[PDB]
Amino acid sequence: IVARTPKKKPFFWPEQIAGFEHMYDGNDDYPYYLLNRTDENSGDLPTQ
């Protein structure tokens, strides 16, 4: 159970982090995390 169980990591949509993909790898060089908001067809569905 200790060995083969997956660890704890967030569940992201592929487009909630469309950009900013080098911020969530753990480099610890930025003061905050960023998430984009708007969409082309739908208005503003992605959320925090």
Partner: protein, 153 residues
């Protein structure tokens, strides 16, 4: 794929919008084709963002060739069904028409599958920090005076 040319993309988008097809007896007018291909080129520029954005096989015309309607596009077979759906969604405000909900859903699906592979490929884990010791179990980097990880560099 029979949709090799940009004009095929424009005609498919117009047929989807119901403006000009053969299921309706109307025919495509050339200036509509020119406007739609300009809109297609502008829309495909934004998505790419010079790489930082969606990466799909696409050749941008340098305008050395005068007619941009006839030249080929480098789109792979999977992105075609998304590109002209999005083009048809964007053209509708040019007239007074509004796109059907099915077209919007198909465009959403197409863009999602356009970006999913790049999202998978770009999810990489950062290396060890600079001040991280390598344990005494390595037994080779420990004997090579290589005690600490290089860092993110």
């Amino acid at each position: 794929m029979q949709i090799k040319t940009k004009g095929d993309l424009v005609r498919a988008a117009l047929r989807k919008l119901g403006v000009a097809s053969d299921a309706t007896l109307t025919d495509v007018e050339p200036q509509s084709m020119q406007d739609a291909v300009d809109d297609l080129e502008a829309m495909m520029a934004e998505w790419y963002q010079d790489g930082k954005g969606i990466i799909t096989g696409y050749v941008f015309s340098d305008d050395e060739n005068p007619p941009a309607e006839g030249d080929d596009h480098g789109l792979r077979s999977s992105a075609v069904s998304a590109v002209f759906h999005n083009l048809a969604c964007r053209i509708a405000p040019d007239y007074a028409l509004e796109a059907t909900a099915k077209i919007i859903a198909t465009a959403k699906y197409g863009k999602e599958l356009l970006y999913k592979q790049t999202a998978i490929s770009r999810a990489k884990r950062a290396p060890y920090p600079s001040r991280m010791p390598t344990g005494s179990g390595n037994s080779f980097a420990n004997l090579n005076e290589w005690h600490y990880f290089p860092g993110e560099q």
